[PDB]
Amino acid sequence: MQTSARNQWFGTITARDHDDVQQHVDVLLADGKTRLKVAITAQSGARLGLDEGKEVLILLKAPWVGITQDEAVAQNADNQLPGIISHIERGAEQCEVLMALPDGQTLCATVPVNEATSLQQGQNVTAYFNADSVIIATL
């Protein structure tokens, strides 16, 4: 393990449903405060033993992370992490946006260059993403 996913977080499963095709798990992160929702196939839930108490790694690729200042957009998403932009690197087609989480962690998002022009270091924003944008990995 070393994956390209720029966001790799420790978490503990605290709930799992039992749909036959796609199930959802609740995951409590290392801060003992942040809660995520993640979808996986029923087969994977069983294979990895994703039951209450199971320790895992959350793999979230940079381009899956949206950045917004709108409360509806953030509350409409499955997951939302507030924080402050610590750095922006502009590029020709994409921009790297780093946001500080109270986590002491740095979240990384890859945002299309045209959509990042209004984003600036120092802004208080919310990072958000779908439950199906996350891969769960077992140590």
| 19 is a contact residue toward Ni ion (CB under 5 A) | yes
Q: What is the largest CA-CA distance in the chain?
A: 44
Backbone angles phi, psi at 43, to 5 degrees: -60, -45
Residue closer to a second copy, measured from CB, 21 or 33: 21
Written as six digits, the tokens of 60 are 């979230």
CA distance 44 to 125: 33
Identity of the residue, 56 or 74, whose beta carbon is nearer to a second copy in the bound complex: 56
Site for Ni ion in 22-81 (CB under 5 A): 24
CA Rg, the chain, in Å? 15
Q: Write out the residues near a second copy by the rule CB under 8 A.
A: 1-6, 19-22, 39-45, 47-48, 50, 59, 61-64, 89-96, 108, 110, 132-133, 135-138
Q: Which is nearer to Ni ion, 17 or 31 (CB)?
A: 17
Asked if 100 and 106 count as a contact pair (C-beta separation under 8 A), the reply is yes
Q: Which is nearer to a second copy, 19 or 71 (CB)?
A: 19
Residue 40: CA atoms inside 13 Å, Cβ hemisphere, count?
26
Q: Does the footprint of Ni ion cover residue 17 (CB under 5 A)?
A: yes
Q: Among a second copy, Ni ion, none, what does residue 24 contact (CB within 5–8 Å per kind)?
A: Ni ion
Contact positions vs Ni ion (CB under 5 A)? 17, 19, 24
